[PDB]
Scaffold this motif. Structure first.
Motif, mmCIF file in Angstrom:
data_model
loop_
_atom_site.group_PDB
_atom_site.id
_atom_site.type_symbol
_atom_site.label_atom_id
_atom_site.label_comp_id
_atom_site.label_asym_id
_atom_site.label_seq_id
_atom_site.Cartn_x
_atom_site.Cartn_y
_atom_site.Cartn_z
ATOM 1 N N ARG A 10 0.830 -1.195 0.000
ATOM 2 C CA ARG A 10 0.000 0.000 0.000
ATOM 3 C C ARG A 10 0.870 1.252 0.000
ATOM 4 O O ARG A 10 2.037 1.199 -0.401
ATOM 5 N N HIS A 11 0.314 2.368 0.475
ATOM 6 C CA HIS A 11 0.593 3.721 0.015
ATOM 7 C C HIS A 11 2.033 3.993 -0.401
ATOM 8 O O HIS A 11 2.257 4.793 -1.312
ATOM 9 N N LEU A 25 1.010 9.915 22.740
ATOM 10 C CA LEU A 25 0.267 10.283 21.539
ATOM 11 C C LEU A 25 1.189 10.450 20.336
ATOM 12 O O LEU A 25 0.820 10.087 19.215
ATOM 13 N N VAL A 26 2.388 10.994 20.539
ATOM 14 C CA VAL A 26 3.321 11.132 19.424
ATOM 15 C C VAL A 26 3.762 9.762 18.924
ATOM 16 O O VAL A 26 3.830 9.515 17.710
ATOM 17 N N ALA A 27 4.074 8.850 19.846
ATOM 18 C CA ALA A 27 4.441 7.502 19.444
ATOM 19 C C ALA A 27 3.285 6.814 18.738
ATOM 20 O O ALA A 27 3.496 6.058 17.786
ATOM 21 N N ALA A 28 2.053 7.057 19.191
ATOM 22 C CA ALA A 28 0.897 6.474 18.520
ATOM 23 C C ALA A 28 0.741 7.033 17.116
ATOM 24 O O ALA A 28 0.389 6.301 16.186
ATOM 25 N N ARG A 29 0.988 8.329 16.947
ATOM 26 C CA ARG A 29 0.976 8.926 15.617
ATOM 27 C C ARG A 29 1.966 8.219 14.703
ATOM 28 O O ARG A 29 1.614 7.773 13.601
ATOM 29 N N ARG A 30 3.211 8.090 15.160
ATOM 30 C CA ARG A 30 4.229 7.457 14.329
ATOM 31 C C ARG A 30 3.882 5.999 14.050
ATOM 32 O O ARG A 30 4.050 5.515 12.925
ATOM 33 N N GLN A 41 1.260 5.752 11.475
ATOM 34 C CA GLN A 41 1.897 5.998 10.185
ATOM 35 C C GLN A 41 2.606 4.749 9.678
ATOM 36 O O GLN A 41 2.600 4.464 8.473
ATOM 37 N N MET A 42 3.221 3.990 10.585
ATOM 38 C CA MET A 42 4.044 2.847 10.211
ATOM 39 C C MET A 42 3.283 1.530 10.142
ATOM 40 O O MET A 42 3.887 0.512 9.790
ATOM 41 N N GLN A 43 1.990 1.508 10.466
ATOM 42 C CA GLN A 43 1.242 0.253 10.483
ATOM 43 C C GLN A 43 0.433 0.046 9.202
ATOM 44 O O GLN A 43 0.577 -0.985 8.539
ATOM 45 N N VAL A 44 -0.428 1.003 8.853
ATOM 46 C CA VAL A 44 -1.173 0.957 7.599
ATOM 47 C C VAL A 44 -0.825 2.114 6.679
ATOM 48 O O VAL A 44 -1.029 1.997 5.463
ATOM 49 N N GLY A 45 -0.272 3.202 7.201
ATOM 50 C CA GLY A 45 0.158 4.294 6.360
ATOM 51 C C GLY A 45 1.519 4.050 5.746
ATOM 52 O O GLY A 45 2.237 5.008 5.458
ATOM 53 N N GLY A 46 1.891 2.785 5.551
ATOM 54 C CA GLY A 46 3.147 2.477 4.890
ATOM 55 C C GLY A 46 4.286 3.153 5.605
ATOM 56 O O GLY A 46 4.318 3.218 6.837
ATOM 57 N N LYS A 47 5.213 3.704 4.831
ATOM 58 C CA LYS A 47 6.256 4.571 5.363
ATOM 59 C C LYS A 47 7.062 3.848 6.441
ATOM 60 O O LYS A 47 6.976 4.153 7.631
ATOM 61 N N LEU A 50 12.415 4.047 10.191
ATOM 62 C CA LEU A 50 13.768 4.461 9.849
ATOM 63 C C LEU A 50 14.835 3.706 10.629
ATOM 64 O O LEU A 50 16.025 3.967 10.419
ATOM 65 N N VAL A 51 14.448 2.783 11.504
ATOM 66 C CA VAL A 51 15.397 1.950 12.240
ATOM 67 C C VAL A 51 14.999 0.497 12.002
ATOM 68 O O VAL A 51 13.811 0.213 11.791
ATOM 69 N N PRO A 52 15.935 -0.450 12.015
ATOM 70 C CA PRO A 52 15.561 -1.847 11.781
ATOM 71 C C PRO A 52 14.710 -2.397 12.914
ATOM 72 O O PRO A 52 14.794 -1.950 14.060
ATOM 73 N N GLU A 53 13.881 -3.380 12.576
ATOM 74 C CA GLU A 53 13.017 -4.048 13.538
ATOM 75 C C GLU A 53 13.560 -5.436 13.855
ATOM 76 O O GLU A 53 14.304 -6.035 13.075
ATOM 77 N N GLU A 54 13.165 -5.940 15.019
ATOM 78 C CA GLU A 54 13.625 -7.219 15.552
ATOM 79 C C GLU A 54 12.428 -8.099 15.883
ATOM 80 O O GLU A 54 12.304 -8.647 16.981
ATOM 81 N N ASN A 55 11.518 -8.235 14.918
ATOM 82 C CA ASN A 55 10.182 -8.800 15.096
ATOM 83 C C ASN A 55 9.292 -7.893 15.928
ATOM 84 O O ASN A 55 8.179 -8.290 16.294
ATOM 85 N N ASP A 56 9.746 -6.681 16.230
ATOM 86 C CA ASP A 56 8.994 -5.787 17.092
ATOM 87 C C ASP A 56 7.735 -5.306 16.391
ATOM 88 O O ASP A 56 7.703 -5.131 15.171
ATOM 89 N N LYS A 57 6.689 -5.095 17.178
ATOM 90 C CA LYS A 57 5.507 -4.443 16.652
ATOM 91 C C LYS A 57 5.861 -3.034 16.190
ATOM 92 O O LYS A 57 6.919 -2.488 16.517
ATOM 93 N N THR A 58 4.957 -2.442 15.412
ATOM 94 C CA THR A 58 5.198 -1.096 14.905
ATOM 95 C C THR A 58 5.318 -0.095 16.045
ATOM 96 O O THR A 58 6.148 0.821 15.995
ATOM 97 N N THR A 59 4.501 -0.259 17.086
ATOM 98 C CA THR A 59 4.496 0.699 18.187
ATOM 99 C C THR A 59 5.839 0.716 18.911
ATOM 100 O O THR A 59 6.358 1.788 19.252
ATOM 101 N N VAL A 60 6.417 -0.459 19.158
ATOM 102 C CA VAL A 60 7.705 -0.493 19.833
ATOM 103 C C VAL A 60 8.779 0.113 18.952
ATOM 104 O O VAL A 60 9.720 0.734 19.453
ATOM 105 N N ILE A 61 8.668 -0.046 17.634
ATOM 106 C CA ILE A 61 9.632 0.590 16.742
ATOM 107 C C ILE A 61 9.488 2.104 16.814
ATOM 108 O O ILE A 61 10.479 2.844 16.754
ATOM 109 N N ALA A 62 8.251 2.589 16.929
ATOM 110 C CA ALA A 62 8.034 4.023 17.078
ATOM 111 C C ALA A 62 8.694 4.540 18.349
ATOM 112 O O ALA A 62 9.393 5.559 18.332
ATOM 113 N N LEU A 63 8.486 3.838 19.463
ATOM 114 C CA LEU A 63 9.142 4.228 20.709
ATOM 115 C C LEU A 63 10.657 4.180 20.564
ATOM 116 O O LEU A 63 11.370 5.056 21.067
ATOM 117 N N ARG A 64 11.163 3.155 19.883
ATOM 118 C CA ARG A 64 12.600 3.012 19.703
ATOM 119 C C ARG A 64 13.172 4.200 18.944
ATOM 120 O O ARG A 64 14.191 4.774 19.341
#
Lengths: 69, 72
Positions: free
Chosen positions: A41-42, B19-24, B27-33, B36-50
């Motif tokens: 997607r996007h 709220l800022v981490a939730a925004r990011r 963005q990173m879950q269904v808003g693609g994008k 900017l840091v590699p993931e380690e099987n982490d959920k999108t939210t933990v990557i945002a916090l990272r």
């Protein structure tokens, strides 16, 4: 006035490459359909629409090639 | 990630951090994008916090990017 028996809303299928050449009549939709598979997607939409201006041109060909049709 | 102390001072409030981490993350879950840091099987939210802890993501940055693409 029962235009149904004479003219309903009718679909028209066209298949245009970059140069606006028709491939709809050369391959049917169904056999074509098995090959397609949606992708990301996007991010994908942006990456492919990086050159989306061509679509505006494509219509001027596609219309020009399907209006007669 | 286990604790979130490092992210507190990056966004001083500990709730605006949420709220800022939730925004990011949204963005990173269904808003693609992709993150900017590699993931380690982490959920999108933990990557945002990272990334918030890494300092390369903040509410200002998200607003800047949103405005930039909204100009498009």
């Amino acid at each position: 006035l029962q235009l149904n028996r004479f003219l309903p809303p009718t679909p028209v299928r066209m298949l245009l490459d970059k140069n606006g050449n028709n491939l709809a009549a050369q391959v049917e939709f169904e056999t074509f359909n098995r090959q397609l598979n949606a992708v990301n997607r996007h991010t994908g939409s942006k990456l492919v629409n990086a050159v989306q201006q061509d679509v505006h041109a494509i219509l001027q060909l596609g219309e020009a090639q399907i209006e007669k049709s | 990630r286990v604790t979130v102390q490092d992210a507190v001072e990056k966004i001083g409030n500990r709730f605006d951090l949420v709220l800022v981490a939730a925004r990011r993350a949204r963005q990173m879950q269904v808003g693609g994008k992709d993150p900017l840091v590699p993931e380690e099987n982490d959920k999108t939210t933990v990557i945002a916090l990272r990334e918030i802890e890494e300092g390369l993501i903040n509410n200002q940055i998200l607003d800047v990017r949103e405005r930039q693409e909204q100009q498009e």
